[PDB]
Amino acid sequence: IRLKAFDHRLIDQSTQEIVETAKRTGAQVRGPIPLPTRKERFTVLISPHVNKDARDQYEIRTHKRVLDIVQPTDKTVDALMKLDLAAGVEVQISLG
């Protein structure tokens, strides 16, 4: 299982929404593993007509997060996907 979102106050708060709501149904799912983080810097110029040394630089992040089942016997999380997706979490399934 792999998860992609934009802020750690969603994506690392929806794993407990999956770990609790799958281990309850009997199957063993281990602890989630972090991945390296995408970081993209964007330095943009700020003045309309030119004054070059005034700048401003941003950064867009992307948090990744990987789950790991042990015994696949539950289609419970397959129906509870619209619940576990909330606003900006994308879940590609790797049911190991």
Binding site: T43, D53, R55, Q57
Partner: protein
């Protein structure tokens, strides 16, 4: 047992240092110590905390170091072995706090800032 685990980081390096009783076995990344560090003064700097605590002949030393620069890995071992020597007791604690070996060197590189060219150098005006 008597295996002792020692880590140490200096200038974005990282060295696994294992320490156990032996007879002068100094091996790093499956290489000899004189062979690994080619023609530098830091061949003796890795021995400087060892010969200070008069244990140069009494241990096996197994070192695995990753990353960093050439003479930055040699500093990682020197900080790394001092943490491995103080797993025993605090008898050699005062022999190394006074020696200035235990403190990790915090001096890391500084980022380029806009307007400037280097970290602090700026172009010439008139």
């Amino acid at each position: 047992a008597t295996q002792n685990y020692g880590t140490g980081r200096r200038k974005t390096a990282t060295a696994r240092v294992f320490l156990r009783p032996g007879t002068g076995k100094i091996s790093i990344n499956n290489r000899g110590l004189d062979q690994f560090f080619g023609r530098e003064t830091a061949r003796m700097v890795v021995r400087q905390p060892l010969e200070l605590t008069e244990t140069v002949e009494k241990f096996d030393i197994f070192v695995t170091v990753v990353g960093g620069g050439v003479s930055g890995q040699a500093g990682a071992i020197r900080h790394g072995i001092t943490r491995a020597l103080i797993e025993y007791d605090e008898t050699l604690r005062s022999s190394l706090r006074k020696a200035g070996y235990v403190t990790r060197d915090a001096r890391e590189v500084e980022r380029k800032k806009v307007g400037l060219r280097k970290a602090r150098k700026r172009p010439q005006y008139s």
